[PDB]
Amino acid sequence: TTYADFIASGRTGRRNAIH
Amino acid sequence: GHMGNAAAAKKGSEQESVKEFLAKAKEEFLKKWESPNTAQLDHFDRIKTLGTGSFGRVMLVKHKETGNHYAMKILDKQKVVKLKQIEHTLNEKRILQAVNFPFLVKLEFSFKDNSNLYMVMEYVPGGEMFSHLRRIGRFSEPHARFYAAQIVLTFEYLHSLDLIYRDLKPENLLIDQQGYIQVTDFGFAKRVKGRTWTLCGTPEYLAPEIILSKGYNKAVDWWALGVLIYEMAAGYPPFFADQPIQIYEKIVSGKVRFPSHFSSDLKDLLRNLLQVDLTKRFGNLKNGVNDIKNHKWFATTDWIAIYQRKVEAPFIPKFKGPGDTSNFDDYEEEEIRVSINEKCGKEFTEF
Numbered sequence: 001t002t003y004a005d006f007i008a009s010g011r012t013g014r015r016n017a018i019h
Numbered sequence: 020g021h022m023g024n025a026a027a028a029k030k031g032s033e034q035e036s037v038k039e040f041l042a043k044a045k046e047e048f049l050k051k052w053e054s055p056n057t058a059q060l061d062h063f064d065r066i067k068t069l070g071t072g073s074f075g076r077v078m079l080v081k082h083k084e085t086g087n088h089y090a091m092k093i094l095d096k097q098k099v100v101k102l103k104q105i106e107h108t109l110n111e112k113r114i115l116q117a118v119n120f121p122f123l124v125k126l127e128f129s130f131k132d133n134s135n136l137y138m139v140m141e142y143v144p145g146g147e148m149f150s151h152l153r154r155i156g157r158f159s160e161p162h163a164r165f166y167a168a169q170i171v172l173t174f175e176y177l178h179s180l181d182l183i184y185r186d187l188k189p190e191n192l193l194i195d196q197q198g199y200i201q202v203t204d205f206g207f208a209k210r211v212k213g214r215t216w217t218l219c220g221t222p223e224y225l226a227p228e229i230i231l232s233k234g235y236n237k238a239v240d241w242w243a244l245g246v247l248i249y250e251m252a253a254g255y256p257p258f259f260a261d262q263p264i265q266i267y268e269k270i271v272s273g274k275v276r277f278p279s280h281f282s283s284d285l286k287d288l289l290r291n292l293l294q295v296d297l298t299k300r301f302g303n304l305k306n307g308v309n310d311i312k313n314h315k316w317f318a319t320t321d322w323i324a325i326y327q328r329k330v331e332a333p334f335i336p337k338f339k340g341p342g343d344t345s346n347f348d349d350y351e352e353e354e355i356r357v358s359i360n361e362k363c364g365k366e367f368t369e370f
């Protein structure tokens with residue numbers, strides 16, 4: 001599922017701004 | 020047409036009243052921007068760390084004389100200098116002192132000492148939207164719309180002041196005691212009447228034209244609103260991948276997929292916000308914000324009532340009294356050491 005793909009991305013936690 | 024005479028006259032008058040409000044709001048902002056050490060560290064008891072960044076940390080504090088609780092952002096000056104964020108820090112303080120809006124956090128005190136800069140603002144006790152979204156999974160469309168309408172009004176306000184926000188995401192949105200949104204972080208906000216060019220933001224929320232290294236304008240905030248609405252309603256953002264570079268390829272592709280449970284009205288709004296083509300993106304057209312506020316997905320939204328905070332929130336966070344921090348995660352507690360030698364004094368003279 002798309003949700004499973006989201007989990008698989010590993011970016012499910014708090015995201016930093018780019019630097 | 021779509022509106023009869025009564026609805027059309029009501030809408031037109033409402034839009035005119037918004038103009039009159041924003042004109043007065045701009046005048047008040049500029050007066051405060053033109054003419055802004057209002058406390059000291061031993062005026063507060065430090066209670067608990069509420070959040071952390073590369074700058075330092077945000078702590079719950081109690082103002083000793085008054086007993087009131089506040090959130091105190093502590094920035095290590097040497098860290099700020101090393102991170103090349105001098106201008107961001109001074110600009111954030113300058114914005115927070117000057118703006119006034121029910122969904123923008125109120126700064127109460129600011130001061131500095133040999134080592135740190137301090138911003139004391141209202142304590143927003145209901146936690147990050149991010150935690151609530153990940154815990155609940157996704158928000159219903161009415162729940163997402165309640166939040167979205169607050170961002171629309173907040174961006175309508177900031178853009179009338181020529182401020183681009185540039186870092187919208189659930190992580191930057193706090194929930195107050197009445198279930199309404201508070202925006203606190205302005206580290207990437209900038210006064211931009213025309214265009215600007217800095218690569219900044221968070222990968223999932225970057226507009227294509229930022230990724231593509233173009234000169235861009237306030238329409239990047241309306242793209243970020245599309246990402247936010249999508250993430251609130253889906254529980255995940257429209258563009259994700261293992262690494263930022265792959266997220267960027269998806270963003271610029273012009274393609275977006277929607278969960279089957281998204282309403283048609285929602286998908287239509289999102290296709291118009293997540294529009295790569297600037298000549299077609301809602302929020303960037305001749306009709307301005309009105310294309311968004313008058314969209315079918317917002318038809319049930321009473322914009323004045325949202326502004327007045329008279330809508331019953333779909334979610335009221337757990338509030339066990341003042342100074343309660345149960346809606347916030349635990350962070351490792353460092354120590355606020357203050358050097359006997361002044362650091363970076365010249366760089367932060369205006370703070």
Ligand SMILES: Nc1ncnc2ccccc12
Nearest residue numbers: 070077090141142143203
């Ligand atoms: N104003 C704040 N209230 C509560 N928690 C926070 C966390 C980060 C920044 C500001 C605040």
